[PDB]
Enzyme design. Structure first.
Site, PDB file in Angstrom:
ATOM      1  N   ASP A  96       0.815  -1.218   0.000  1.00  0.00           N
ATOM      2  CA  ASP A  96       0.000   0.000   0.000  1.00  0.00           C
ATOM      3  C   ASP A  96       0.861   1.287   0.000  1.00  0.00           C
ATOM      4  O   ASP A  96       0.585   2.249   0.742  1.00  0.00           O
ATOM      5  CB  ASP A  96      -1.024  -0.039   1.159  1.00  0.00           C
ATOM      6  CG  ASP A  96      -2.242   0.860   0.971  1.00  0.00           C
ATOM      7  OD1 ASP A  96      -2.461   1.341  -0.163  1.00  0.00           O
ATOM      8  OD2 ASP A  96      -2.967   1.081   1.957  1.00  0.00           O
ATOM      9  N   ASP A 112      -7.200 -10.164   3.361  1.00  0.00           N
ATOM     10  CA  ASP A 112      -8.282 -11.003   2.846  1.00  0.00           C
ATOM     11  C   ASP A 112      -9.670 -10.495   3.229  1.00  0.00           C
ATOM     12  O   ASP A 112     -10.503 -10.317   2.346  1.00  0.00           O
ATOM     13  CB  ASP A 112      -8.095 -12.473   3.274  1.00  0.00           C
ATOM     14  CG  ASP A 112      -6.836 -13.152   2.744  1.00  0.00           C
ATOM     15  OD1 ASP A 112      -6.061 -12.490   1.994  1.00  0.00           O
ATOM     16  OD2 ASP A 112      -6.622 -14.341   3.076  1.00  0.00           O
TER      17      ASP A 112
END
Ligand code: ANP
Ligand code: T3W
Ligand code: MG
Length: 301
Positions: A158, A185
């Site tokens: 990120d 997830d």
């Protein structure tokens, strides 16, 4: 305290600051909702919101990120369990962590408050960040990515200006890296994802390199360098990568970002190559009063 920071290179200033943060952390034990008092909102993203808070038992001001996840109590307990590994991530280039816990459908990630905020916030005020300043930012990012990979075998996943934090002491640090596989997830029209990540390909460190390259182009030029959702992703996948404008930026910085933005991830530079690039070697030797620049352009005391 019995510090085990020998593995890190650490200059004297870096050592003193990292020991001071870890010494304050000793005032912090188990974290609970009732033990916080909200001061203000720092910012909000897609995942959640982050508040500047006061931890009443310790008197420490912290940044508390809340992520709404009211899922199976067993799967969220695994997320929290995985987040505890952040207790082992001690680096001059990684934002300090105090603890992570769950309460009322929210997982809280409590971290070191960085009083200069993120580079997207400073970008707003500064307009454009000078090349010399981006030199030091690039060093911090590569060193932080290296630490995460070498020491904890974790990829950031990120990298973007909002996930690069700064403070009045001139420190540049990464936050919001993929430490918890289960959090990833269980979880914009401005994208920092590599062309291979947008197509499907398994995450690689090369995908963070692209993300860093694009972030530097945006910070140097003052605008997202690429609108309609599909149009934007189609340009990343199928059109040539953006380049820095010539004349205004040195050849070393233009070559550095070009190497990060190579569409082919095999041709694209890796961390080892970037650490010895002429842009980094040049930036490392430069005396840049980052703290003075930060404090004067965002009005920090
Ligand atoms: N430790 C911190 N100290 C000070 N400000 C912080 C801290 N952590 C986050 N922030 C600020 O809070 C803002 C919102 O953070 P965040 O919720 O992570 O959104 P984001 O970075 O834009 N997206 P994402 O990282 O993908 O989840 C950031 O952009 C920073 O300005
Ligand atoms: O993977 C993630 N997905 C969504 C939100 C999120 N926050 C973190 C995080 C926060 C502070 C620090 I220090 C390290 C990691 C990781 N994360
Ligand atoms: Mg963030």
């Amino acid at each position: 305290l019995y510090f085990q920071l020998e593995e890190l290179e650490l200059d004297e200033q870096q050592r003193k600051r990292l020991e001071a943060f870890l010494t304050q952390k000793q005032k912090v034990g188990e974290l609970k909702d009732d033990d916080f008092e909200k001061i203000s909102e720092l910012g909000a993203g897609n995942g959640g919101v982050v508040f500047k808070v006061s931890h009443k038992p310790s008197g420490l001001v912290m940044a508390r990120k809340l992520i709404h996840l009211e899922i199976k109590p067993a799967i969220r307990n695994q997320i929290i369990r995985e987040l505890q590994v952040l207790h082992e991530c001690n680096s001059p280039y990684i934002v300090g962590f105090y603890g992570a816990f769950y309460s009322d459908g929210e997982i809280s990630i409590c971290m070191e408050h960085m009083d200069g905020g993120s580079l997207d916030q400073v970008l707003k005020k500064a307009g454009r960040i000078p090349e010399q300043i981006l030199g030091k930012v690039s060093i911090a990012v590569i060193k932080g990515l290296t630490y995460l990979r070498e020491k904890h075998k974790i990829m950031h996943r990120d990298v973007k200006p909002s996930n690069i934090l700064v403070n009045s002491r001139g420190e540049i640090k990464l936050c919001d890296f993929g430490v918890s596989g289960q959090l990833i997830d269980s979880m914009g029209t401005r994208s920092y994802m590599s062309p291979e990540r947008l197509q499907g390909t398994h995450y690689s460190v090369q995908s963070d390199i692209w993300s860093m390259g694009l972030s530097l182009v945006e910070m140097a030029v003052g605008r997202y360098p690429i609108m309609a959702i599909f149009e934007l992703l189609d340009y990343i996948v199928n059109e040539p990568p953006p380049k820095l404008p010539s004349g205004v930026f040195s050849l070393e910085f233009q070559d550095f970002v070009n190497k990060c933005l190579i569409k082919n991830p095999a041709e694209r530079a890796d961390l080892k190559q970037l650490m010895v690039h002429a842009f980094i070697k040049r930036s490392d030797a430069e005396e840049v009063d980052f703290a003075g620049w930060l404090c004067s352009t965002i009005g920090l005391n």
